[PDB]
């Protein structure tokens, strides 16, 4: 039931809802996308195949030449991840595409070619993703963060009644493709349709209809319905449809067949319509004035002479009726207009349309798109055809086509990627329908309208950009006269494609530096959705509606975890169970509720399918078989939520965690925290520095193991077996017989990362958590990364905390810390820094790395060897020389007093300048690693030769002692095989080992297995040989340094930073704080047993901030530590194993109807003792996110120990011995050490380097820069009367060149007086204004 890695320390689960779906692989959003990118797909759908098939074949200008694509393959990377992180290059694989050049024969449409030439051409290198979803690009690990952008398709927004005085809603449509132009439609306050392309100047919407080869009669046929009048020899009777009369009031008598229906001044009521339908009236007699405003439909010309009586779209009148009366026309077609249901918008737009033909419309479009040049007919036609109807310059998508068809209620989901006439007509018709009153405007914040790009999609887009860049040159090259018997390699330049891919991966907004100070930081950086980037909104132009949390974020995007600041709501984080659709839309799992039972089958529903069903809640009780135990349950149907009967529900939530991300699901008692405090705690939990010793969370959630294993910090066993050898840097697992392939010798070797630096200069270190001769199984952890304890995530330490005010040392948010916390090195962290010393080639000569530095004594050069580089293990403080470098310089040209001094003392000058590398001031570490890189033309000093000898020895030793282990395992396998089927008890050890693999057996597959083992051993020997030669040739080879630099020396210092006042600590509930004092042990408040508290926190921070989760975490930590203390007392008295069994089972049987039955009676009396030894520092407790432990269970746990159920104890004062007048809340809370250390914040300056144009001090602490005394501080000094302080701020301290030297000399001469002068920035301003045409001057 329980795994061997989890029988060591079982966390007591207080959750009560049984889980149905286990948490998926967390980094599966980064790994699936790039897998789709670089994958041989037989259909040209995903990745490089799609790009190659969408660009190739490249055909010349009908020159009987064609370059066509065959296949591709990714080569082997030159260096693996570690080598390219050390050297400083990209981890990538060479892309090698196989092409084929074919030359046709003249006078043939598709005739037989005359020659073929199939060649494989190399085009660029594409970076490769590591096992964890990161990219090594220039030695640094980067993460390509996903993007949340608007899906392609047609979106019918509105105007909400603003932007106009009358308050009219101006409905608009917009067609957004993946690649192409924007075909926006809209309305003006006069209800005339308009169209604008690429957000340019506005044009009438009928211009595009005419440009699509439509007449006026055809347009009126499309967008209107006819009213057939007729000349029945008198009165102009018309055909009548009763539905046309709805919402009308006729001033006359509507009388048909001599029957009165609607009287004078009577509105045509619904009863009147029903009466007309019942009588089946299809023809009526209307007054002659009824056509006084009706718009005709078509062109009616004279029968006699052919003259134009009335053109299409012109309102008829009495004279026009007379002119069409005796002409010979009897059928008159008029448009159906109205004011409420069928508005005449197209007719009015036609009446505003300036053009009257297709060519006029095309010319007007050309003048709008490209103003200022004379338009040709063919140029305008080409522009219009290349706007939206060309496969190259326009592509909607597959997603765009699907959304386009869904929005227009079509039945097909696939089709052409370019627009057609039908698409534009349908968009216009639906916009007009929305204007009429039927139809709803879309919301652009719905998660059914927003889509997720990832690494594979964006990389494919950039690769396609590079491909079209190279196809331009290939098409130019084939048509350039030459025939030419050339190969398919002289036309392709690999620099455009590789340049595009390098531009994307290295210099992009979504390709950012990885956050590597936690497993949680990496995991939550890879699962990050960003609304910014290339193709999305900016931090300044973003409004309030994209920042808000939509009802469709439920289960797909975390509501709380988002950065607070300029981009809040733009950098959202993916939820726990959320997935991505086939098209890119977020979806979340729900389990189907059949007729009456909640089944276990799970369906993934996107944000549009979710609205149709009514989805129950995870906090719903089931009666052990599926039925809802209540008679009506609470569910959310369409955004809104209310109570529904149990016979109406369709789906149920999988879990209570599915609404929050993986960073906000690590906060115990989240439901008691305020949302602002929960946001702050989620955002601060990933700044925690990994300390010297990961402890564990004593009050956790159960999400710790998932975060620690699904990241890449631990070492997880690939196959089961028995640990054969453990070491500080290696674990060897002897795989089980049933998990081994028939050929190989089954042993797994795990090499551990030891003391490397992360991106944030912290320390990365894996230490084994298994012991020698210990069974492991698949999935068990073998080593713990940074912030991991036995496979669980452990961000900080849990310490005894009292909530009381203590003499003002925890005043606002400050923290009072005991001295035991700093004595025990609980918050001591190791920081590793890289320092480089580049030796370049100057004009006066090269720079050397000699240890013979001028002007320094023998005391400073004591830590340097003969080669001028510091020793390994040397403890260097600030100012100590690490690498001694001297640069040549010219002639000093010293002053008369200086040369008199030289003449008196006879000490000649030095021609070289001391430019040595030295430790930065303030830091004090130990040199743990020195790396020397040398250009391949320069002699190597003795230190580089020693480093090379060490590296070659280590490479040979590692390969030798991996081959020894593999050979030993293979021979043990052979010996075990020889025991059965040809048994040899002691007839085996006399002959040499090499003869064990060439012995015969029966005519079965056992001889084939012995021979397979022998072949494997021979392959291992030759593999060792070839790997050794490769390693030697790779170690001895030179380096590809930058142009100019001769050699680089890098020194790594490890600094152990203890805790101190000013360091920022926090908890998981948004309770940050800067510690203020390190109190002695005897000054801390202590309870009845003399045990002092470790941290004293202010009780005043709790009521105003409503983060009540920390109080309950304190009480539950106290209960857990009480159980641990009881177990520890039973273990110190070495009572018995039955007593331990009884108490641990009683502790695991709490509380009220929980899951996680443990059944401690199946343990083996030695697994009980390991468990009890792991539970003697406190029993870990799992409190799920919204399931949790009720406070009654906390009281029961407190009773189970011997603690008071109040959670508060009588506390004494360490300095006076007098008890505090009230009981105070003592307990254990899990504290974190955020990465805001005070020795990285403190800065001070008096005089340093000044800037170049404006002679002012530089920026802070990187170049020893001053503090900006900005405009608001100037206002503050003007609000006082401080006129002299201000004047020295802006003249002598900053900018006046003569005055600052004079002031320095005055200060060192004991005179405090200023001679201000005028700043240099004002002179710069005068020169810059004067270098315009303007003459500004100072006059007196």
């Amino acid at each position: 039931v329980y795994s061997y890695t989890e029988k060591k320390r079982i966390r007591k689960d207080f959750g009560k809802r049984p889980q149905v779906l286990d948490v998926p692989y967390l980094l599966s959003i980064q790994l699936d996308s790039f897998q789709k990118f670089i994958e041989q797909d037989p259909e040209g759908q995903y990745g490089l195949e799609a790009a190659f098939r969408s660009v190739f074949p490249i055909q010349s200008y009908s020159g009987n030449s064609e370059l066509q694509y065959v296949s591709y393959r990714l080569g082997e990377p030159v260096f693996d991840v570690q080598e390219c992180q050390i050297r400083g290059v990209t981890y990538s694989a060479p892309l090698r595409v196989k092409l084929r050049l074919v030359i046709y024969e003249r006078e043939a449409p598709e005739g037989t070619v005359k020659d073929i030439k199939e060649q494989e051409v190399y085009m660029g290198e594409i970076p490769l993703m590591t096992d964890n979803g990161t990219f090594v690009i220039n030695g640094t690990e980067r993460v390509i963060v996903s993007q949340l952008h608007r899906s392609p398709g047609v979106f019918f927004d509105s105007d909400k009644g603003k932007t106009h005085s009358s308050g009219k809603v101006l409905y608009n449509a917009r067609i957004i493709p993946y690649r192409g132009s924007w075909l926006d439609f809209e309305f003006d306050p006069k209800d005339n349709l308009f169209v604008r392309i690429d957000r340019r100047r506005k044009l009438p919407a009928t211009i595009i209809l005419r440009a699509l080869n439509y007449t006026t009669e055809q347009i009126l046929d499309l967008f209107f319905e006819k009213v057939i009048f007729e000349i029945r020899d008198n009165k102009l009777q018309m055909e009548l449809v009763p539905e046309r009369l709805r919402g009308e009031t006729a001033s006359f008598d509507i009388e048909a067949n001599g029957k009165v229906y609607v009287e004078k001044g009577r509105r045509i009521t619904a009863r009147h319509i029903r009466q007309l339908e019942k009588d089946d009236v299809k023809l009526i007699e209307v007054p002659v004035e009824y056509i006084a405003g009706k718009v005709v439909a078509k062109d009616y010309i004279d029968e006699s002479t052919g003259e134009l009586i009335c053109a299409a779209n012109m309102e008829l009148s009495l004279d026009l009726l007379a002119k069409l009366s005796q002409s010979g026309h009897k059928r008159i077609e008029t448009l159906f207009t109205n004011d409420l249901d069928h508005g005449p918008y197209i007719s009015e737009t036609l009446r505003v349309d300036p053009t009257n033909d297709r060519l006029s419309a095309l010319v007007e479009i050309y003048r709008m798109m490209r103003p200022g040049e004379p338009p040709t007919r063919e140029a305008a036609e080409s522009l219009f055809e290349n706007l939206f109807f060309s496969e190259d310059r326009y592509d909607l998508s597959a997603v765009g086509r699907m959304k386009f068809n869904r929005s227009l209620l079509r039945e097909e989901i696939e089709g052409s990627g370019i627009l057609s006439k039908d698409d534009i007509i349908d968009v216009m018709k639906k916009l007009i329908d929305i204007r009429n009153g039927k139809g709803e405007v879309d919301d652009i914040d719905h998660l059914g309208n927003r889509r997720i790009r990832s690494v594979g999609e964006m990389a494919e887009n950039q690769f396609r950009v590079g491909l079209v860049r190279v196809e331009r040159a290939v098409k130019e090259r084939l048509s350039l006269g030459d025939l030419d018997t050339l190969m398919p390699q002289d036309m392709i330049n690999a620099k455009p494609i590789s340049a595009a891919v390098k531009e994307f991966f290295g210099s992009s907004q979504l390709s950012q530096f990885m956050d590597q100070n936690n497993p949680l930081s990496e995991i939550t950086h890879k699962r990050r959705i960003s609304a910014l980037g290339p193709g999305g909104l900016t931090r300044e132009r973003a409004g309030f509606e994209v920042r808000d949390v939509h009802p469709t974020h439920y289960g797909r995007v975390c509501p709380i975890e988002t950065p607070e600041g300029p981009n809040i709501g733009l950098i959202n984080s993916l939820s726990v169970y959320a997935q991505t659709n086939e098209y890119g839309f977020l979806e979340t799992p729900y389990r189907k509720v059949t007729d009456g039972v909640v089944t276990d089958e799970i369906h993934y529903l996107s944000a549009i399918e979710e609205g149709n069903y009514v989805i129950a809640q995870a906090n719903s009780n089931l009666d052990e078989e599926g039925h809802f135990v209540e008679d009506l349950v609470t569910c959310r149907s369409k955004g809104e939520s209310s109570l529904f009967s149990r016979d109406q529900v369709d789906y149920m939530d999988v879990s209570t965690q599915q609404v929050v991300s993986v960073g906000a699901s690590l906060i115990p008692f989240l439901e008691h925290d305020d949302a602002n405090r929960a946001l702050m705690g989620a955002n601060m939990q990933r700044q925690a520095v990994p300390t010297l010793r990961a402890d564990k969370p004593l009050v956790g959630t159960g999400m710790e193991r998932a975060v620690a294993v699904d990241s890449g910090v631990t070492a997880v066993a690939k196959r089961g077996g028995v640990v054969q050898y453990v070491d500080a840097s290696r674990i060897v697992i002897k795989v089980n017989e049933d998990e081994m392939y028939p050929g190989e010798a089954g042993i797994d070797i795990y090499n551990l990362t030891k003391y490397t630096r992360s991106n944030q200069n912290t320390c990365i270190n894996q230490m084994p958590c298994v012991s020698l001769g210990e069974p492991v199984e698949r999935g068990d952890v073998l080593a713990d990364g940074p912030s991991t304890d036995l496979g669980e995530l452990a961000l900080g330490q849990n310490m005894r905390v009292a909530f009381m005010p203590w003499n003002g040392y925890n005043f606002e948010d400050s923290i009072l810390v005991s001295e035991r916390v700093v004595q025990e090195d609980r918050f001591t962290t190791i920081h590793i820094q890289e320092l480089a010393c580049v030796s370049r080639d100057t004009k006066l000569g090269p720079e050397e790395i000699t240890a013979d530095i001028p002007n320094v004594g023998e005391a400073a050069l004591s830590k340097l060897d003969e080669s001028g580089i510091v020793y390994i293990g040397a403890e260097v403080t600030g100012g100590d020389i690490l690498v001694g470098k001297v640069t040549p310089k010219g002639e000093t040209q010293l002053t008369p007093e200086e040369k008199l001094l030289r003449a008196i003392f006879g000490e000649k000058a030095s021609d070289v300048k001391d430019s040595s590398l030295r430790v930065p001031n303030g830091v004090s570490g130990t040199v743990i690693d020195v790396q020397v890189f040398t250009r391949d033309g320069v002699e190597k000093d003795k230190r580089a030769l020693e480093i090379e000898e060490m590296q070659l020895k280590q490479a040979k030793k590692d390969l030798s002692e991996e081959l020894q282990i593999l050979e030993a395992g293979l021979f043990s396998r052979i010996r075990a095989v020889l025991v059965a089927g040809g048994v040899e008890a002691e007839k085996l050890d006399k002959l040499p080992r090499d003869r064990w693999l060439e012995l015969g057996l029966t005519d079965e597959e056992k001889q084939n297995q012995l021979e397979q083992l022998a072949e494997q051993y021979d392959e291992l020997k030759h593999e060792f040989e070839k790997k050794l030669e490769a390693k030697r040739r790779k170690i001895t080879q030179g380096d590809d340094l930058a142009p100019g630099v001769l050699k680089i020396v890098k020194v790594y210092l490890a600094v152990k930073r203890r805790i101190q006042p000013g360091d920022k600590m926090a908890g998981r509930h948004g309770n940050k704080g800067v510690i203020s004092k390190i109190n002695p042990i005897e000054d801390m408040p202590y309870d009845e047993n003399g045990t002092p508290v470790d941290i004293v926190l202010n009780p005043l921070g709790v009521p105003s901030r409503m983060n009540i989760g920390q109080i309950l975490e304190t009480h539950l930590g106290m209960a857990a530590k009480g159980i641990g203390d009881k177990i520890n007392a039973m273990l110190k008295q070495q009572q018995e194993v039955a007593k331990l069994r009884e108490f641990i089972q009683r502790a695991y049987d709490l509380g009220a109807d929980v899951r996680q039955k443990v059944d401690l009676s199946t343990f083996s009396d030695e697994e009980v003792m390991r468990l009890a030894e792991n539970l003697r520092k406190g029993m870990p407790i799992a409190t799920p996110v919204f399931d949790g432990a009720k406070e009654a269970e906390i009281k029961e746990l407190l009773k189970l120990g011997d603690l008071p159920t109040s959670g508060q104890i009588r506390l004494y004062d360490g300095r006076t011995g007098e008890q505090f007048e009230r009981p105070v809340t003592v307990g254990y809370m899990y504290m974190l050490k955020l990465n805001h250390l005070v020795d990285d914040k403190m800065h001070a300056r008096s005089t340093g380097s000044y800037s170049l144009v404006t002679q002012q001090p530089l920026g802070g602490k990187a170049q020893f820069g001053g503090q900006r005394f900005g405009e608001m501080e100037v206002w503050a000094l003007e609000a006082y009367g401080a006129a002299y302080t201000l004047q020295e701020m802006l003249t002598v301290k900053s900018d006046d060149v003569n005055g600052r030297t004079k002031m320095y000399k005055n200060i060192v001469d004991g005179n405090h007086q200023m001679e201000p002068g005028m700043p240099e920035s004002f002179n710069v301003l005068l020169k810059e204004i004067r270098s315009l045409g303007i003459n500004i001057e100072l006059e007196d």
Binding site: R367, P371, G372, E373, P374
Partner: peptide, 14 residues
Amino acid sequence: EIGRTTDPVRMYMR
């Protein structure tokens, strides 16, 4: 066409 655009290359082409 005079004068719609600034575009000193378009004016040269014109």
